[PDB]
Amino acid sequence: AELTPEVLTVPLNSEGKTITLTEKQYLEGKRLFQYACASCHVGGITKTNPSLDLRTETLALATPPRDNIEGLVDYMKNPTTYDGEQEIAEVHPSLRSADIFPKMRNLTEKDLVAIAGHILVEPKILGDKWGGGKVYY
Amino acid sequence: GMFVLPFMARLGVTGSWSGWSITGETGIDPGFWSFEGVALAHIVLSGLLFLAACWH
Amino acid sequence: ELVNVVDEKLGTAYGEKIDLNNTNIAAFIQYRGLYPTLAKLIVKNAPYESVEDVLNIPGLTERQKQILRENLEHFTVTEVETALVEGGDRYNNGLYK
Amino acid sequence: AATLTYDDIVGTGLANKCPTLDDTARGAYPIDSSQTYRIARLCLQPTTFLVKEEPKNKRQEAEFVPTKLVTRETTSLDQIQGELKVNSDGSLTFVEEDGIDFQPVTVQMAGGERIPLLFTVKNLVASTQPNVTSITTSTDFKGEFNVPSYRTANFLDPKGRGLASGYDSAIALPQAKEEELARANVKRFSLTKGQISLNVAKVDGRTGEIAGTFESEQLSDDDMGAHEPHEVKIQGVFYASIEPA
Amino acid sequence: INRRVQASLASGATLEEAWSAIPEKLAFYDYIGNNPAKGGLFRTGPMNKGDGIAQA
Ligand code: CLA
Ligand code: HEC
Ligand SMILES: CC1=C(/C=C/C(C)=C/C=C/C(C)=C/C=C/C=C(C)/C=C/C=C(C)/C=C/C2=C(C)CCCC2(C)C)C(C)(C)CCC1
Ligand SMILES: CCCCCCCCCCCCO[C@@H]1O[C@H](CO)[C@@H](O[C@H]2O[C@H](CO)[C@@H](O)[C@H](O)[C@H]2O)[C@H](O)[C@H]1O
Ligand SMILES: CCCCCCCS[C@@H]1O[C@H](CO)[C@@H](O)[C@H](O)[C@H]1O
Ligand SMILES: CCCCCCCS[C@@H]1O[C@H](CO)[C@@H](O)[C@H](O)[C@H]1O
Ligand SMILES: CCCCCCCS[C@@H]1O[C@H](CO)[C@@H](O)[C@H](O)[C@H]1O
Ligand SMILES: [Ca+2]
Ligand SMILES: [Cl-]
Numbered sequence: 001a002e003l004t005p006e007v008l009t010v011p012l013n014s015e016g017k018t019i020t021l022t023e024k025q026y027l028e029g030k031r032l033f034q035y036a037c038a039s040c041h042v043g044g045i046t047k048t049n050p051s052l053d054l055r056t057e058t059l060a061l062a063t064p065p066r067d068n069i070e071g072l073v074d075y076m077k078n079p080t081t082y083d084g085e086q087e088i089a090e091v092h093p094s095l096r097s098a099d100i101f102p103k104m105r106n107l108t109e110k111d112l113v114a115i116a117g118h119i120l121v122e123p124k125i126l127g128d129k130w131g132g133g134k135v136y137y
Numbered sequence: 138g139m140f141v142l143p144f145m146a147r148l149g150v151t152g153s154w155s156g157w158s159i160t161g162e163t164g165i166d167p168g169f170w171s172f173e174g175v176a177l178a179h180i181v182l183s184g185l186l187f188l189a190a191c192w193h
Numbered sequence: 194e195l196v197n198v199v200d201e202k203l204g205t206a207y208g209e210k211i212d213l214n215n216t217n218i219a220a221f222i223q224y225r226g227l228y229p230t231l232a233k234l235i236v237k238n239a240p241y242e243s244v245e246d247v248l249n250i251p252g253l254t255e256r257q258k259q260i261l262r263e264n265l266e267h268f269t270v271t272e273v274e275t276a277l278v279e280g281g282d283r284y285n286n287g288l289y290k
Numbered sequence: 291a292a293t294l295t296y297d298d299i300v301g302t303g304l305a306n307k308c309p310t311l312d313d314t315a316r317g318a319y320p321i322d323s324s325q326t327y328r329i330a331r332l333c334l335q336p337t338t339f340l341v342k343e344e345p346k347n348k349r350q351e352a353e354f355v356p357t358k359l360v361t362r363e364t365t366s367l368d369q370i371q372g373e374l375k376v377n378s379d380g381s382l383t384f385v386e387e388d389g390i391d392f393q394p395v396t397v398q399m400a401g402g403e404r405i406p407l408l409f410t411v412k413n414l415v416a417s418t419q420p421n422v423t424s425i426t427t428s429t430d431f432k433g434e435f436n437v438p439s440y441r442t443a444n445f446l447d448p449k450g451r452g453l454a455s456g457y458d459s460a461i462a463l464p465q466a467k468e469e470e471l472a473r474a475n476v477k478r479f480s481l482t483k484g485q486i487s488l489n490v491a492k493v494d495g496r497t498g499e500i501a502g503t504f505e506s507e508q509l510s511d512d513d514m515g516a517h518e519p520h521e522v523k524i525q526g527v528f529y530a531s532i533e534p535a
Numbered sequence: 536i537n538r539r540v541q542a543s544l545a546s547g548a549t550l551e552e553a554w555s556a557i558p559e560k561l562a563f564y565d566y567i568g569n570n571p572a573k574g575g576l577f578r579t580g581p582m583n584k585g586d587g588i589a590q591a
Contacts (some may be wrong), residue, residue, distance in 0.1 A: 081230070083229065153400075276443040276479040287455075
């Protein structure tokens, strides 16, 4: 098995558009995810709220939808609760809250895309392991 | 089938460290000389006598 | 006659749908728009005689009422089960991942 | 008094005691029945736990007997709040809403038997006599409360059996006949009622603070249906601050 | 056992008849309590002492 261009092709928006990430993009997203996110989201779960994971199916049912690049990038700028009802930048890392979450300062649009790409590609590789927790280790 | 208990009781040992008495009282404090303290005293005595035997 | 009441309840609609009177709050993550805001209002205002009674929670916005209507089909009500609602278990039932 | 800080209190045992009022507080706190009220803090400090002995006959006067607390200074109920309604007959009814309204407690009977109980006033509704135009040292509250299972539904026994989790059989005895073990294998969740009296001994009419003695009756732990509970009588002191809501 | 049952079904037996034609002796070998690798070093005595005396 390989990390093919097909594996690296993910939804850009809600409207059927896709983007094909490069191998470099994927690997940078992984590095950045580790750097900025994995302290809470290691392996696709969420340590400070295990009820919400990063599985693609879970992301698809968030409001607004988060199962695409643009939705994830918006989340990293202006995070909300799962119903979209409250903005949570004060307690979740975001560009809007990079003052209080300093590992978000100087993330570029490309960096956010790369992280988003990681989040969508990883379950395509790992299956249920992504967002599965210890059951699937 | 109690054989030594009644001897302890005849002479005034009626309580346990656990809080009961053979008259059916509760929350009683027998001091050291409960049934248990008498038993421990006998065991310690036994030991001391054993050691004195060795010396003699 | 000795019965495990949780196992018994799995044979009711509690085993098939979100029971507004019993089910732990995380279940509301299954469908779009229910968690956390509506989820909290539902659990706080339980129990309900019928699923449609969820529409009457004081203070719901017009949008919230629409969202509840879209999801009535995924809800049920059964009798309150003490074992499922004590301990604050509807807010945290000891299951994480 | 020199208003105590956490560092003044920590480790002294004072944290498990209810506030007290001194001897000057034999006043009357006026009740204006157009006004709504609240209890801002209700505190219950148990000083004795009595357990009803389970005699052979049946019928005889079975007495409540003294016990020794083995779980240390962890017994008090506090930070309890709720509505204080003024009823049409001039009685008051306290409806408990929230607070630290339970404590697990283990007391030991003479001979060693340990009696765990969920000492509680969960969902207390307690009322005065009619015509309480002022709360005085004649006032009292009587009411009832809920007493849920001492262990909640996830609790697993030493062989891993539970109600909401766990095995449903005795797995170490794979070919044992199941009928004899049903009471142990099938966990049950108790919910019973208790009764409490609050006797007001002291009232500060300026501040709305009251204190007194209480006696509560409730069942002990039944170990998720494995054995019969015991009846328990809890006696102690209480404190409450009343405020217009 | 499955082979015998299938041969019976294929000869027109009902399911009741097919399974009723299996000898109890054959069925009892297909039970793990007769497996010699299910015991214990200090679990003493006959197999009957654990699961019981098989009746039917
Ligand atoms: C090869 C020898 C052998 C074997 C395979 C058997 C097999 C059997 N016997 Mg028989 N039997 C034997 C010899 C044997 N027997 C002898 C010599 C006698 C006379 C004592 C008997 C008397 C006997 C009776 C009376 C009964 C049996 C029964 C049985 C059955 C149950 C066995 C059981 O529970 O074991 C249990 C085995 C153990 C608990 C293992 C013991 C391990 C030892 C104690 C270890 C010692 C360690 C050592 C001290 C360490 C030293 C350290 C040092 C060097 C530093 C089984 C079919 C039972 C039965 O069902 O009969 C119908 C029964 O009632 N047998
Ligand atoms: C712990 C302090 C966290 C870190 C670091 C990051 N996230 Fe997070 N994330 C966290 C929580 C507690 C939650 C749930 C928030 C809520 O109340 O709704 C989240 C949620 C997300 C989501 C939404 C997932 C969903 O299914 O809808 C996403 C997409 C997400 N987080 C992404 C993300 C990224 C990319 C991070 C690094 C830049 C990151 N999170 C950090 C807690 C924490
Ligand atoms: C008074 C009193 C009493 C009593 C008392 C008594 C009874 C006592 C006893 C005592 C005793 C009874 C003592 C004893 C002692 C002993 C000893 C002291 C010993 C010693 C020994 C030795 C020293 C030894 C050595 C050796 C050895 C060991 C070995 C070999 C070698 C040799 C020999 C070297 C009472 C309690 C009632 C009460 C209170 C008071
Ligand atoms: C004042 C506030 C309002 C008070 C509200 C408190 C009342 C509780 C809600 C009433 C619910 C009706 O009562 C409930 O009915 C449903 C539907 O028949 C039953 O659940 C049922 O579900 C399924 C349907 O797939 C059946 O397979 C099952 O045999 C059956 O038990 C519950 O076992 C019962 O507990
Ligand atoms: C072997 C160690 C001895 C332990 C001693 C514990 C003393 S305990 C002591 O015993 C007295 C004597 O009757 C009583 O009067 C008193 O009430 C009791 O507390
Ligand atoms: C060998 C050392 C062990 C000795 C222990 C002596 C216990 S001392 C004993 O303790 C009881 C409390 O249970 C009291 O009722 C009793 O008054 C006291 O003397
Ligand atoms: C030297 C004696 C030391 C051992 C004393 C053991 C504690 S004393 C013991 O306590 C049990 C539990 O309360 C009681 O049931 C029993 O009646 C009593 O004898
Ligand atoms: Ca009084
Ligand atoms: Cl899930």
